[PDB]
Subunit: 248 residues, 2 copies
């Protein structure tokens, strides 16, 4: 990984490399985020998912193959990450996220940045509660299922301003019932979210999950570097800007 160091300072490069991130719910915007992180140069990862991959999980994550069906999600994701970078520090957790288990929460506060991608809203609100109570830096992605639009993309806003997305509204209601309404960050589209018909649905327009993966990648890179406004780092490291015509 040298083009990133060509872009941003090396100090930031080994700040990200000496970075620890925990990913919950590898059944959506998490596993592609895992690929992006391990290729960017991220070190410790905190994968946490008890399910096994399916063909729908095959279309979701890059770390999968028709020969990998029914294999544990964490196993496939970790082996692919190690293939990308043998020097990695992947950590298997399993640890289904029913609202009773909290040793994974012990490991969570042990970590640095917590990424939430739990497909179950109950698990999502449990993680948000735990992180808010322990003041941990948490990013709660509401996924990208049932979304269609691409002109407007996911942007990191507070849970107070969460809107439109059905999952975002459900998590907002659950958190307000629990008593927290502004502490946690979130990643929402603010775009059309079809409800479809009861058949269980899900959604999964293929570009939308990679939309979410890219946005989560960007936010994880923002928070993994020691707070410096990495835009400022590029400004002080690069030469041209090229907004209107080009500024040195």
């Amino acid at each position: 990984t040298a083009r990133l160091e060509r872009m941003i300072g090396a100090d930031v490069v080994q700040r990200i490399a000496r970075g620890r991130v925990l990913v919950c719910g590898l059944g959506g915007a998490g596993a592609p985020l895992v690929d992006m992180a391990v290729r960017a140069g991220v070190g410790r990862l905190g994968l946490l998912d008890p399910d096994r991959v399916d063909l729908s999980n095959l279309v979701r994550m890059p770390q999968a193959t028709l020969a990998d069906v029914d294999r544990r999600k964490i196993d496939v994701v970790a082996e692919r990450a190690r293939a990308v970078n043998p020097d990695a520090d992947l950590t298997l957790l399993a640890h289904r996220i029913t609202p009773d288990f909290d040793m994974g929460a012990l490991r969570a506060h042990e970590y640095d940045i917590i990424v939430d991608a739990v497909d179950d809203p109950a698990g999502k609100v449990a993680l948000i509660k735990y992180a808010v109570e322990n003041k941990l830096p948490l990013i709660s992605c509401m996924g990208a299922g049932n979304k269609t639009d691409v002109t407007q993309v996911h942007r990191v806003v507070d849970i107070a301003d969460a809107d439109v997305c059905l999952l975002a509204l459900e998590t907002k209601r659950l958190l307000a019932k629990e008593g927290i309404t502004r502490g946690v960050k979130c990643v929402v589209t603010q775009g059309d979210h079809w409800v479809f018909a009861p058949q269980d649905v899900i959604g999964n327009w293929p570009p939308c999950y990679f939309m979410a993966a890219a946005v989560l990648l960007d936010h994880v890179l923002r928070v993994l570097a020691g707070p410096e406004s990495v835009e400022d780092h590029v400004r002080g490291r690069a030469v041209g800007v090229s907004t209107k015509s080009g500024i040195v």
Copy 2:
């Protein structure tokens, strides 16, 4: 008659894998000598089991040193036990057998325990009783004959071992592991002192007897509360030990009295399991039983070790040397097998236990025995869908004449030969697929042949008896429907010529009992059990060549006329168990097994030995493809062998090839109105979101991803996973350490390898039926081959880093009116807020590489209507860096555009709007049907 009374002093390799303890033995029996433990390697300390199964057998072979060629069996356990351990052991025994041509002997764990506790003991006659301990199967069985075990009693609630462990925990006197607690509790009996202490203490005892056979656990439940609060409770331990011994000996002597009353009296009191170390129990049993002698094996042969499996396999192989000849088939890995006939308290009390008259000498089941009888020419009577069959091997004049004499031979008549396979029919009719007209008979096979369809094939050679034919065309070779008949014919040779069982003037065969009565005095192998042969309405003759329908039956010419071709005229099978066909991959089968087992239903899976059900299938049947695989006959055999009342459902995985299993058997099984399960496709969520026809259209689409230095590789991943079919690549370069970030299809052990090849093999791995037409080649001036393939292909999306190649391809596309969208500027950008745009390049803002391409296209001559993907954000000069989010974002935008083009009218927007029943916009949730 259990140690050694046979010739052929054989050495057997026993492997046991049912419980946590893994053991392998090389026992040797035979001649007139006691068995000798040549090697007894074992490990008690599943992934660990599968890891250790091979080192243990290898080390046992090394230590034995007798010879890997002297071993004549690989006898392994398939009886009750942990399912994963059973699969590992069986999958380790079958590997050895296949690699070294040794017959495989499946044995039962309980039978193994009984026989191992029967080892040594100088002489032990076979009429002996067993007291199987060490598990939740504390059973009283009587070994009337080898394989004739009758289960007199079984513990209804709990075993003595659990009670001893619970009492030890209550007293905290574990003192080791497993039976060590029981050893300590038995040691605690101090005779007079503990008896006086118990007399002083209150104690408690209330088993009150459980029916007559056996059973008790209330004493342990009372003892839990008795010893939870008390302190020094040596007297309580002595009391519970004495009460357990009293119950055991009482039920044992009751069973002995009952069996001596109504059946053959026992000659030993073999006790298995870990309770045999109980000195008090042994003394009480010896004092109580009297004439019958108590047999107690050493504890080394009680903790589920390989010696029992070796000895049981040895006894089975010696008893029936004709069986277990050379080939393993019917490898059924059960989880709850039991040990034979059940009688229990009431049937033991009344005494006779029903009755089977000597007239009813029908040898039910034992399909292998009937198959060998047919091979030797012995007459075998088996049931079919039509009249109860009675026949022998076709390629034997003596056998068919014997059949005729058995039924009296009123005449010869046309005699139908029953055949069950594709290969046997071809071989017996005319070989080499008969002629070019065989395309109709194969269709008849795949449509109706299992059942009452009588293909009057005109023969062509092979070997047929003159008596069976009674004409120039051979009589109507037919697949029967009764699964026993299909199994017998599959295990038979060329075919089975079974006219009928009609020795009397009025046949009325119907059930197996009636035909057995009609043939009380005969020289025949036996009669198989009747499974519903009462539907004797005959079949339909369907002469293949001149499609002529002779005397007809159930099938009727209407459905034989599926494609007309003229129809000149001159119920069905039903498994008792809920058979379910699983369509998809092995992963979906394992997921279905796990999920359905978690629902409480117990499952029986039918799969070839190559497959591997995960851990949770109750009974696993391995087809063991040996000859040429199911072909229907193996599938019927497996279905019959898993029709046990225990199993709730049977899962059969229909392979996508659907070539070996060519028959209507799977079609009939899947037609049970819910028995068919289809794995959700890779685009299952996509087909949920947009119509199936839309996803099919995307699949039929083509893409011409150019140089994959930029967003080409992620785009290829997205397209392949989304369902795109034909693709093309135009990047003749090799990956590098820096290139690793932009490639999702890359590993550190891939550097300097061709990028196009890596992407192609990853795409083929994700989708097998993915048509890739790798072009390679550099910018390729004049792109003649590239131009022709662009004509053949569809949207020609490019990510060429070289500005010249990009503009050359854009010029070609605009001059030839081909659909094009580019990406150009994707690196050196920082902000992800706006790095996504689909605009014509004439409208493109700074995106510096977009300006470069703009100038070059303006110099080329035309720039109005070519699409592009510009950032519209911040393009830092940096005196060619990248932001990892930005490349994947651009890949997502390119994927969106590709699927918009590959959709058609108004694309995914109107497609979902027609499909979806409601939209949650930025204001409210509007619903439109």
